[PDB]
Symmetry: D2
Subunit: 367 residues, 4 copies
């Protein structure tokens, strides 16, 4: 099925009015919304409750404006990446199917979305091979759901997986199991990293790694993974976004890599991959309304430098480098797109090269 | 009227002045000819940032050790440390020194000139009021004459460092039966920079002498060259006027423009072009070819809580003050233009450039 | 005039109202008889604390589900959530409900009574000025009558929750050509609490009607029972007057005293004794024997930057706002008296108790 | 030799004037100062530069007012624990020897101090048995230096050991070694924990642990250890404080344990152990000038609770629990002593039981 993609701003933490307005104006249909991926204005760490508030707001609009039951609505994968430091604007990217009578099928590659949920992820699985294999299997399922057989047509895989809590850790130990760590913040970075290796395994980017590789072998990464985590579910939510020929629709996705926090060229590369023809040295004013959004990861390098210059991110006990780097890359990124509503996420283990991250772009080409 | 040598050096640690000492040993410049230092330090950028005083002592001790100047003479050298290097911003110092005429090529081309002055003491009473404004305008007058400049249009950058209010100085004001504009120490930073900036704008004929009521409230009143920073390392306004003069010689030239908002990379390019560095249209950092010494700019979160029509949550964020968010964001924006994370980005820009933006100055090496 | 049941319950998570639901199911109290809730939530305690709105929705949904009251009637129940549980402070809610006379033992002994009132809307314009003061004094009047109290001396605790200024409401004020006392959102919290407190002190005859100029500046003007908190969950002053009346019956009684500074455990003991709980001289937490329901108090960092002649660095700390430092400190001081980390400790106490201290109220179970 | 102990406030970050004044008034002699242990007003994390500034200030007073050379002065162990959240007042406890003609020797136990430096601590030693054994050996050396053979007369062991940095980690790997972790904040907690096990080994509190025990076996701890760490030295600084009979002097030290953050009784226990006779339920007003200082550790329990009440310290990404717990326990502690100048330190692995910490008290008894 062909996909409509719409990026809407959130006017406040519990606002889903722009989604409601798209529905009223006939831009998309509530019951055809199949995935939502957004940025929320919480702290972007462990105790970020803005992700819960947005979820309820969006689900209430979907239930109210459609014939779907609140149970069906609850199955819709909605992934919120918290923390909008600096200029980053809270927003949600909405993915919906399009009725056939609204589309002109084309052999040109156009956007497709696949979804899947993994098998249950036990606490003792988190960060270990069991998480990797269960994720890999669900990524293959989502890939098929998207109608994609070739991994090269996958450009962006957004996930949400569980973190470790006092309670789940207690559960692991009650059944004679161990856990990779007991620190909740660490368990997040771990859960993301293990999920990312699963993605890279599923897509043939890497051979199956060992337990020992997880968080250590930073040469091993997915070039399309975007992993987040939270306390909501005990399994992996997968959303695969790629292209398929013969489906029709207006939008196409592309990706590249950001080698470091300042790599605007890598963002331009993603937009070019997505199907825009741009000048050698593009500027935001060249986009002509055609860029829907970009989705990327970023991180502070372990060597404490960017382009041979020392920075103090890693030792900063006042403001965690997660927030510093997020705001920095938010600006770098919004300077390319000209739109502060950009999807910039942190916690990037095994997601792009060390000090960098994958970057995906969705563009509006027409039929 | 004397030619200037300008060198940007990294700080390897909080108390490191080794690269200054090395410049002196290699004959690049003479200790007694150092007339001003402007740098970035890795502290929190707020009130209780002691990284500014540590760098100050480190640099002054090098200057007094390697020269014939007395620690008293050395103490009158304006050294401005803008704390806070959120994100990629690399701790560094820009050193300005005079050069004997025998080492320069005189030219009718405009080349860099620097004037320095220390205002009268600024009491806590004065901060943010007409007393700060008139004392500053006076020291700016002095500095302009010291640079050999009579026309304000040749001024491209006025960097100041003034006191903010601390518990101790607020205790002082009240012990003498005086009053202070605010007792929120972190608020007092914004006020100190703002009052100083109006003093600069008064001295350069950019605005008519304002009233107490105008300070922080009349944001339409601003200097287009003022870069005012504040901290706890001298109870006087350290003033550094930087412009160009014809017939003096030297390798360096300064230019400026304005950043209309945090994402306005074109405004930074404009400054570099204004400084006389001939660049292609559609420039990229790879065009600089080692020729940009540094940029110096201000940034701020707009009072309307938006950038380019997109809401952000900076002004409501009680976790990480918007000073630090915007500083990291614009650090990245800026370093993406220069390709060098050692950039002078300072926050809190009341009456310094238009609201939501700031002035940006560039020093280039033209030979 | 009606007897009160008071129950303090833990919050197990941010959206947990299960212990309220359990009280209702076990017949401890009736949903429709809940007249006020006062609690602590685990958010940051500042402007962008959304844990208050999450708890609000959770509690109101229990009240509307288990009772015959309409969600509209339920919405008029004053629920005050003081965010920020730094240190040991345990998220919890104190529930106040009426009790049918058939379930109480009438007594000429003083026993708890509660009055409630919601003020008129508070515009952003009004916050911190006489308009807030006179609107509050009026709603406090209403609440006192609702509690069946004519003598202000029988009032021991007036808890309020008022709006603070946010970007959005500041945008509103200006869109209508109005002005605001400040635009520093986090500053506006201190102001909101202070203006409300003067309204309480005016209503209870503690002070003469003050001027705009007195707000935040005349700290000698205060209420000895006011506990004013502020946030973003209603644009009206939720007022809860708590005192004692003779001849009503019930198990609980309230008392109050004052904490002269953050370390004044004796002032907290004094409140408990005032409430009618007979304790040994030289009391210890082990003397309470289950009989202290909760304490409710304010704290603040003194303007002089000292406690008992010792300097602290709270007011100069740009990393962790003194709100959070003092809240954690007094949380521990307080919980060391009660032996129960579930204590109502709120920060920012302008015109609420003497400068550097705050009122403290205690509710005890006497049977 | 007999010891004089004096606690002085720091009026500012670079103030050592009260030390200078003690010397001028003849209270102690500069050249007889043998150790300094204090609290500084920095953030108490990794990037805390207030410890450097205080060091220089104190050493300059010692060099100026005595005949010791700046090299001899540099050998004086000075240990700064950063972070003074809440009411905690910056201060330094000064330990000096007393000339014989100033003392009356007594068989009563009185205060003694021993110092020692360990063998070099390589990065690969940190957190492992090599650190444990090298520390144990230096603790035995310091114990002998104090004139103590019985470990039961040791009440407080304050240390300073190295953390892991990018550079030292690079060194370890260049020589084919590994490190326990590469995170600097973690390396601090590790360095403290390993040092603490070394102390407990030296004093016979525990049998020699394994690598696997470090940071994991929290049942293993020293009841007198107080460990800090920083980038200054590559070996362990040890300061043993205990009692010896037959030496004379006015002061005596005692200790106990704080079982949890609210355990004022444990602090009272230490003061009683130190030789004060106090009421069953003591109050700060009973101390009658006799308490010099208390020295303790605190921490947030891994179970997320205090006395059966949940708190949100561990998940708080806005304000690290180190700062929360420090401020909370600062208040608890200052409420017992009545003096906000208290030595409260965090990072307490293997230093007291889990959720608690050792507490030591020095009291003034006379001859
Ligand atoms: N694991 C995550 O979800 C990391 N998140 C945490 C959060 O959303 O609060 C930050 C981000 O996505 O940028
Ligand atoms: N007072 C200020 O201007 C803040 N300063 C930071 C500082 O204290 O140095 C300049 C900046 O970072 O913007
Ligand atoms: N506005 C306030 O009073 C802050 N509030 C916290 C909050 O937002 O709930 C009370 C407190 O913690 O002291
Ligand atoms: N390891 C340490 O030194 C922990 N410190 C760190 C610091 O001093 O900055 C905090 C404390 O001692 O309470
Ligand atoms: Cl169809
Ligand atoms: Cl002697
Ligand atoms: Na990466
Ligand atoms: Na500006
Ligand atoms: Na008060
Ligand atoms: Na411990």
């Amino acid at each position: 099925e062909a996909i409509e993609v719409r990026k809407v701003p959130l006017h406040s933490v519990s606002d889903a009015s722009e989604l409601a307005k798209l529905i009223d104006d006939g831009v998309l249909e509530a019951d055809r919304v199949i995935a939502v991926i957004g940025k929320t204005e919480g702290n972007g760490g462990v105790n970020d409750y803005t992700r819960i508030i947005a979820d309820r707001a969006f689900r209430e609009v979907l239930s109210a404006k459609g014939n779907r039951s609140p149970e069906e609505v609850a199955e819709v994968p909605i992934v919120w990446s918290g923390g909008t430091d600096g200029v980053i604007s809270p927003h949600a990217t909405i993915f919906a199917t399009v009725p056939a009578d609204k589309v002109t099928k084309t052999d040109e590659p156009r956007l497709t979305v696949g979804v899947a949920m993994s098998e249950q992820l036990l606490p003792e699985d988190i960060g270990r091979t069991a998480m990797i294999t269960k994720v890999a299997a669900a990524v293959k399922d989502a890939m098929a759901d998207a109608g994609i057989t070739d991994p090269a047509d996958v450009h962006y895989v957004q996930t949400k997986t569980p973190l470790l809590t006092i309670h789940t850790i207690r559960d692991a130990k009650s059944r004679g199991k161990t856990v990779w760590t007991e620190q909740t913040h660490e368990s997040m970075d771990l859960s993301n990293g293990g999920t990312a290796l699963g993605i890279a395994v599923a897509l043939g980017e890497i051979d199956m790694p060992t337990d020992e590789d997880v968080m250590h072998s930073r040469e091993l990464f997915s070039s399309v993974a975007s992993c987040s985590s939270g306390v909501e579910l005990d399994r992996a939510q997968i959303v695969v976004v790629g292209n398929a020929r013969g489906v029709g629709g207006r939008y196409r996705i592309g990706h590249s890599v950001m080698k470091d926090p300042l790599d605007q060229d890598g963002i331009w590369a993603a937009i070019r991959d997505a199907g825009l023809e741009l000048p050698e040295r593009p500027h935001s004013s060249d986009l002509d309304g055609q860029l829907v959004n970009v989705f990327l990861k970023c991180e502070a390098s372990q060597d404490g430098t960017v382009r041979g210059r020392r920075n103090a991110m890693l030792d900063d006990s006042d403001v965690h480098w997660h927030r510093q780097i997020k705001s920095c890359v938010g600006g770098v990124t919004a300077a390319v797109t000209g739109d502060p509503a950009v999807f910039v996420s942190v916690s990037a283990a095994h997601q792009g090269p060390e000090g960098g991250g994958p970057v995906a772009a969705i563009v509006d080409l027409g039929q």
